[PDB]
Design a protein around this ligand. Structure first.
Ligand SMILES: NC(=O)[C@H]1CCCN(C(=O)C(c2ccccc2)c2ccccc2)C1
Ligand SMILES: [Zn+2]
Length: 139
């Protein structure tokens, strides 16, 4: 679990969004596994606006932060699950690293701020849904 709180927005994995998230829906995209809902309180997370390919992510399954090199945002095949059929998930960045179902929502960060959140994993890999292109999160 986990979310990004920036301004009057809450960014979560679309497959883990709550009834409240859907009742205050701003934008959602199944192909990116992202959902953004509105909030009453102000969020103090900074979003990175960069092309860094190195950062640090939080891994709940180990209660530890790990440094990773990650690929640029791209279309990657993701196996079928109870949330989606087999499909290509866009804006996804992969790294070699530990991840388990439960780690979704963990923040990936570089020196510029928040890069994305854990969205896929397994096989000694971890996939992050990128949020750096969502410029409206800041205005
Ligand atoms: N974006 C999606 O479509 C995800 C929806 C939830 C499922 N999913 C995973 O990748 C998930 C997983 C769960 C059960 C078997 C295999 C994989 C996982 C595993 C390790 C770390 C994070 C998540 C795909
Ligand atoms: Zn950066």
């Amino acid at each position: 679990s986990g979310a990004i709180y920036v301004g009057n927005y809450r960014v979560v994995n679309r497959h883990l969004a709550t009834h409240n998230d859907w009742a205050n829906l701003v934008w959602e995209d199944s192909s990116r596994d992202l959902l953004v809902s509105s909030t009453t309180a102000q969020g103090c997370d900074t979003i990175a606006r960069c092309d860094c390919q190195t950062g640090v992510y939080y891994c709940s399954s180990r209660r530890k932060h790990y440094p990773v090199s990650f690929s640029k945002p791209s279309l990657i095949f993701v196996e079928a699950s109870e949330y989606y059929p087999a499909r290509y998930q866009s804006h996804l960045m992969l790294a070699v690293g530990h991840s388990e179902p439960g780690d979704c929502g963990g923040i990936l960060r570089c020196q510029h701020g928040v890069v994305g959140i854990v969205s896929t994993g397994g096989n000694g890999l971890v996939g992050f849904a990128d949020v750096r292109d969502l410029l409206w999160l800041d205005e």
